[PDB]
């Protein structure tokens, strides 16, 4: 059975106006700004952007890759697909 989301989990993350996007749940670094309650820090592959999202916007990667893991015209998306598949846990600092 599923657990709660934890840092390291790979997802497709949905934001208004964007396709479901390859992403991961990030750790909060010591001394770094925490997310609001019930939100997780989402790191977006390819763009390397962070946003704060709740579970309704987070789709587990394995279950969803067949639907959402296809090339997309949007800036950074295809890079993002490579990242999530090839080195999802690397530093992209």
Swiss-Prot record:
Widely expressed. High expression is found in heart, skeletal muscle, ovary and testis. Overexpression is frequently observed in hepatocellular carcinoma samples. Residues 7-64 form the PWWP domain. It comes from the Eukaryota. It is found in: Nucleus; Cytoplasm. Interacts with HDGF. Interacts with trimethylated 'Lys-36' of histone H3 (H3K36me3). Interacts with trimethylated 'Lys-79' of histone H3 (H3K79me3), but has higher affinity for H3K36me3. Interacts with IWS1. Interacts with H2AX, POGZ, RBBP8 and CBX1. Interacts with histones H3K9me3, H3K27me3 and H3K36me2. Interacts with DPF3a (isoform 2 of DPF3/BAF45C). Interacts with SMARCA4/BRG1/BAF190A, SMARCC1/BAF155 and SMARCD1/BAF60A in a DPF3a-dependent manner. Belongs to the HDGF family. Acts as an epigenetic regulator of myogenesis in cooperation with DPF3a (isoform 2 of DPF3/BAF45C). Associates with the BAF complex via its interaction with DPF3a and HDGFL2-DPF3a activate myogenic genes by increasing chromatin accessibility through recruitment of SMARCA4/BRG1/BAF190A (ATPase subunit of the BAF complex) to myogenic gene promoters. Promotes the repair of DNA double-strand breaks (DSBs) through the homologous recombination pathway by facilitating the recruitment of the DNA endonuclease RBBP8 to the DSBs. This is Hepatoma-derived growth factor-related protein 2. It comes from Homo sapiens (Human). The lineage of its organism: Eukaryota, Metazoa, Chordata, Craniata, Vertebrata.
């Amino acid at each position: 059975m599923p657990h709660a989301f934890k840092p390291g989990d790979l997802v497709f993350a949905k934001m208004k106006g964007y396709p479901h996007w390859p992403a991961r749940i990030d750790d909060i670094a010591d001394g770094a700004v925490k997310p609001p309650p019930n939100k997780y820090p989402i790191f977006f592959f390819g763009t390397h952007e962070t946003a704060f999202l709740g579970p309704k916007d987070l789709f587990p990667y394995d279950k969803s890759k067949d639907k959402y893991g296809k090339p997309n015209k949007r800036k950074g998306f295809n890079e993002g697909l490579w990242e999530i598949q090839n080195n999802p846990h690397a530093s992209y600092s």
